[PDB]
Amino acid sequence: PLESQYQVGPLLGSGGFGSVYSGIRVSDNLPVAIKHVEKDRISDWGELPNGTRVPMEVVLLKKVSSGFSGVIRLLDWFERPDSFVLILERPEPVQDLFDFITERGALQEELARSFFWQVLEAVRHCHNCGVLHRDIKDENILIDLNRGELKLIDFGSGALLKDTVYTDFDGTRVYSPPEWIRYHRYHGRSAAVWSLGILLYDMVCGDIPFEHDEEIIGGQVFFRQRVSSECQHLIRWCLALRPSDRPTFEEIQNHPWMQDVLLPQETAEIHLH
Template structure:
């Protein structure tokens, strides 16, 4: 028969195994506010941490919508892959260009709740471009460099995002710093081919359209080419599968030769012809910041920079 001390130790160990989410409920630590937005992988609400008033975002994921499950050390039950990937990045110190997960909960009847940092004055890049039109190359370069550096960090720590697009980048409209969000399509990084894809089709490469397979880096670099085109031209280059397979962007605005060459390199039809992330960073357009501003087709910088009132 167990004595009282043994029972207490047993209970402590059990709590330790099951993790901190057993000890304090979500509702005792956070207030969940209005809906901010929803998508294929869940809904996002504004929220507040009760202990200090910190503004957070709360992502709710229904268990029946989870595409991939994985296990965390010390957790008995599997959790959505998104939690595992964000936890992995958090444990290695995080990166300024990647949204940080502060906590997570498995709540009966509500699914999984992810508590995420919520930077002030933020707007997603899709809305940023929709409001301002095509971005001046210097501003596009500022955003793009931050995104590529954040992706390099993620890959270095074994995470591939697989859904890089303007809607998954948020811009701090005062500092012009950006962060990558929404890891719902993410996966552990591997060298071999992937045969599943939950990302956005118009950002996917020809090899996915044609053979339903791809490698992590070549997929990521193709989506970066689509994103950079989107920033400097105001819209994505391809809408239909045949256009993606054609892999020939048609520039609708005056764009410098160096910027065009980087976009075309990222959008090479053959995956092996695309650059690595390191090669993207060392491309002359990225390194020099020397941008041709010929003619009047480019918007003036001032009209495209964010308002302080946002």
């Protein structure tokens, strides 16, 4: 009984992530996001322990639904004749990081440090749960404007984390690494680090560095805004053309530019309230 358990509100958005409606769980008035996905538009399918054939997105969301606030939490899901309905938590008030950067321009490095740090913790949580997001970008990051916490969303392009080469990709091309552009091959962790470099440049410069394939494989990062030497070095490290030259998550968080990060509450009070 999905119609009797939730009160469906206005449409929050639509696109590659299906159609997402605002909702309230009648049992406790908890704000939820109700995401509909058509079966005919599902690429990768998975199987739950019970053997039921569910979309891979449901499998990945369940594996990361540990309560860590850095990822969107799947609360429930339903199957319909031609679609799946996903019940997601809904923090309020929120704005995605794309709209945030569009309205504020390039972010102060103190704010970008706090945001980037939380994204790193969220991605570490995914990898620890065996999940590769494969579509890290500002559009897939929600900002809890009151708590100053970031949430990674839309696992619809993800996959189980493996140590062998990936040959499929359904994420965002301008965030994809040059080894995918050239050879249609990538490993999960080094590809994630590349997208994180694109994301970090996006935050401190106000837009992504590369729009065309030739720029992705070119290996030149021009800084259109004043960016500290420490931040520039971390970005260029993440955007190393050779995957093995890119830093690990530990090396990123140990980088001098990443030290003395603000707490989420401090981030909201200084930069969001």
